[PDB]
Amino acid sequence: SITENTSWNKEFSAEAVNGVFVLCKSSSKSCATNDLARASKEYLPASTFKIPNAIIGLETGVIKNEHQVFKWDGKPRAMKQWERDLTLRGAIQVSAVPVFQQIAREVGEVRMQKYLKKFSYGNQNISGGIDKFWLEGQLRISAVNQVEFLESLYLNKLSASKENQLIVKEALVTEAAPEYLVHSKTGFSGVGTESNPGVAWWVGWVEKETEVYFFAFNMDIDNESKLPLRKSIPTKIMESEGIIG
Amino acid sequence: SITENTSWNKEFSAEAVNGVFVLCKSSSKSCATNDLARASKEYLPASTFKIPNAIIGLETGVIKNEHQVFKWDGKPRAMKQWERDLTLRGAIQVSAVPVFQQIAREVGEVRMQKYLKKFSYGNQNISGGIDKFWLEGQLRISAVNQVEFLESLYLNKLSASKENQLIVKEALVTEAAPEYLVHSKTGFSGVGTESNPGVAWWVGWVEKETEVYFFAFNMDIDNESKLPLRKSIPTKIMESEGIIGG
């Protein structure tokens, strides 16, 4: 399945970044990575968890349908971008944490556990509170597991209805051209401490002509100013592969 | 109950074009157009027909599923961009006529007629050739009918599985930002002469924040260099309406 490509470290060392990129053409059966060990090391998913959380909210009927609006109650939120009504797509795209915290509460620990089992989602440990397990709790997943998850979603092979998978897929589109389509989701757990840094992610897949490439990136982050690297490092790697695009 | 907004006409005259723009906020119960008469006139749909044709291809099973690949057999095609295997979205986005002529033949006249009736698609006249009725045959549809069809698609209300309607919607995404998403399709019947012009279209819808706007534009085309007006005239109107830009 997985092979090391040590040329890809240039991008990490340039920035003194401890991280991993996993990139798979056509399927998870052929991945390459800069760091064999870290590729299956597991980290808080943070807001990449909105992908399965959204699927689960639709499957359970907690989210009515693709057209549900999540209204802002006018009360303060941690980000200005979350202070307004958001569609499902909008709430994923701006990573509106409190929308999904309330979705998780309505889903409930029994159903959330059930679904993460069906999804083979990381260590499947949702302890730490129903509305914060993926943010500061015990849930962990690796970049390889993300790429496996995203591939099932791409093929509509998760245990949820095909309509709900397609709904979340359109919500993930972040770049659209006549012959190049990108689906992707960022994550950022916070800056932690210098001793125990946070994690940042970018995961998704690229459709180019008739090919597909799945990717998952994570890195340790103790400084918010380093945040863009979660897209720029994978972007430069994929550009050097001719994928981007 | 469509209203006329004549102030939009200066965007057409400025470019010496005759055409119509229909724009509906929230639903087709709230539409506005520059030209009430041309808004209901019916024109050859050209490549805009790839929308219903794709849904029908999926419903009939001619198109196997969303990941179907349409293989190029190597024989020459009008455009290099068509001379390659294509996904369903790639074939729509580059408007690869030959892939859809073949889907249309496989669907055949009986089933095609039946879906166009279910979809209330234009004059529903597909006569004269199953693989060109939308390119140079008798099929005709108005800008108001395009917006009503597209709203149905957006709402998953067409007579087709929700799943196939979702497949086709993703294939129509042309613009994407975190709170702005555009689904659309161009079409162009060919450059005509001044007295017998072709038609160019741009149809689709825009989700901005939590609002949705359905739109359909067409214009007479008798000069090839004017083709890009099919996008810049409606773009300018949507700017002045405050949909494009903050």
Ligand SMILES: *[C@@]1(=O)[C]2[C](C([O])=O)[C](O[C])S[C]2C1(Cl)Cl
């Ligand atoms: C989720 O992890 C989002 C992060 C992300 O990756 O998008 C940041 O968004 C820029 S902050 C929000 C949280 Cl941290 Cl919950």
